[PDB]
Amino acid sequence: ENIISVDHLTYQYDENQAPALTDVSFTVHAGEWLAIVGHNGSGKSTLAKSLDGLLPFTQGSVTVGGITLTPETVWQVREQIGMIFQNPDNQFVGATVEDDVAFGLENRQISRDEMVPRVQAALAQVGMTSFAQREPSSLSGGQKQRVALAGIVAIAPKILILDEATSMLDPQGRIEMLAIVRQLRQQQNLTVISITHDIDEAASADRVLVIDDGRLVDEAVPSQIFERGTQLVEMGLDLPFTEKLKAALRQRGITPPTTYQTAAEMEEWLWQSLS
């Protein structure tokens, strides 16, 4: 569980270097798939970092598991939050996969045996056992991401933060990664915050926070968010296909339902209106 209260950030001179956040307040409950979406240059990127020690904000509060975000205590906060970053080429350390997945376990002064089956049982989850030997440059990126995930499953946290991760992957990279963030929740019951512009990701979330120019501007169930039509793209998401189709029907004189409609639901609407 997190609580973020009256949060603001500016860096340097004199309003711009990083995207400013201003008076952001929101809360997340244990088990929640929260999506945070925004246009380019809003603080959604920055919101991700502030939840960890990265970024020293001088206004507002971040609390994670009772512990309140602060210096001399970031580490205890950081220890319940695993963070997959955007750009998988980086964020590695480790000549091989094992080494990496064990990097986290190392810092906790974990030693010897206990690491061996742990890192085994971590790669088993992200389906990467076969790749345990390989060097980072040797593999896809949608795979590099999974071994970052394995590296946080190893330390086995409460909260998994996804700062724009799918964002640099081919479609399979995307599809495969998401699926096992999903099946991860099925077992370990974890809290997933994800900063995004991926529809599928937001589509599989529980709530969506919408960040406009530095501020928390909207907050809803995602089937409700998607009713923003073409208006989606600027807001920071692409369009579901039914929403594209609706937009196209309107251009051609047909006015379709305003509420969201799944592909099944739209099918049935179409059929019934043409039967």
Binding site: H39, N40, G41, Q86, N87, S140, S167, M168, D170, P171, H197, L232, V233, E234, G236, L237, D238, F241, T242, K244, L245, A247, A248, L249, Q251, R252, G253, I254, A263, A264, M266, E267, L270, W271, S273, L274
Partner: protein, 284 residues
């Protein structure tokens, strides 16, 4: 035009640490064409594309691009002009900026093919706009910029070379939905005006349906199926086998077919689908 004639490439000579990335490839893109190249990673997409400006020469076969002709025995020195006739925009092309101002960085390419210093500059100014920037950006350092702002500056610098062929390797990779859309439209504009021909490598099927004139499907160093997008997207299970799929609209349209709706051509875009739905609505 571009014509591939029985082109095959193998890396590393006849020294059996040798691998062929391209085997007997033969294709033809017409003047003012829009080739989308499409297939799994390491299927020879990147190899085909590096052919086009002779960063690679074919191991066998001939390449013919307008006045240019490329054979195994073609000389590097004799091919310099091919690199201004064909503009290559690399994946994440932001990594090649280096000059101390963006004006100077755009101007670089022209300067490299001769071109008076003062004139190269003026052109960069012209180029800064087409790519979407205020002249405020001209005298800034490239490193003062958004990753997406750099992306335009880089692109600008290729466009500044005035190519006839524009090769784009995943031009919108790692960009926001808007950034994607703007970029793609920008090329389309450049294609309709200007009369360019565009070779596009993507994993983005929606894009192929929307902008492509012809699609090349590469499976494992081999190219199978040269067709209009309808031709390629005609068999879903065939495409599935080769680690690809049909556009979103095409899948949806199937479910409509299950309900008894029938269409003329198979819809590949929502506009196309809308068109047919609208026409049926008109009877009803």
């Amino acid at each position: 035009a571009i014509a591939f004639e029985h082109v095959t490439y193998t890396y590393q000579a006849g020294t059996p640490m040798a691998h062929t990335a391209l085997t007997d490839v033969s294709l033809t893109v017409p003047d003012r064409g829009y080739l989308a190249i499409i297939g799994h990673t390491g299927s020879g997409k990147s190899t085909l594309i590096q052919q086009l400006n002779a960063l690679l020469k074919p191991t066998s076969g001939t390449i013919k691009i307008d006045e240019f002709t490329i054979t195994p025995e073609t000389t590097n020195a004799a091919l310099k002009p091919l690199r201004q006739h064909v503009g290559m925009v690399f994946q994440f092309p932001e990594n090649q900026l280096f000059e101390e101002t963006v004006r100077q960085d755009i101007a670089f390419g022209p300067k490299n093919f001769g071109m008076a210093d003062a004139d190269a500059l003026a052109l960069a100014d012209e180029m800064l706009t087409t790519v979407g920037l205020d002249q405020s950006y001209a005298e800034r350092s490239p490193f003062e910029l958004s990753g997406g702002q750099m992306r335009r500056v880089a692109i600008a610098g290729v466009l500044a070379m005035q190519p006839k062929v524009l090769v784009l390797d995943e031009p919108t990779a790692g960009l926001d939905p808007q950034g994607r859309q703007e970029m793609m439209r920008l090329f389309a504009r450049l294609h309709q005006e200007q009369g360019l021909t565009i070779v596009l490598v993507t994993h983005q099927m929606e894009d192929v349906a929307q902008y492509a004139e012809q699609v090349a499907v590469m499976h494992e160093g081999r190219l199978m199926k040269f067709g209009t997008p309808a031709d390629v997207f005609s068999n879903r299970e065939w495409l599935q086998d080769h680690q690809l799929d049909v556009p979103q609209a095409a899948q949806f349209a199937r479910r409509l077919r299950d309900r008894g709706l029938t269409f003329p051509k198979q819809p590949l875009t929502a506009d196309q689908l809308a068109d047919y739905l609208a026409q049926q609505w008109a009877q009803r």
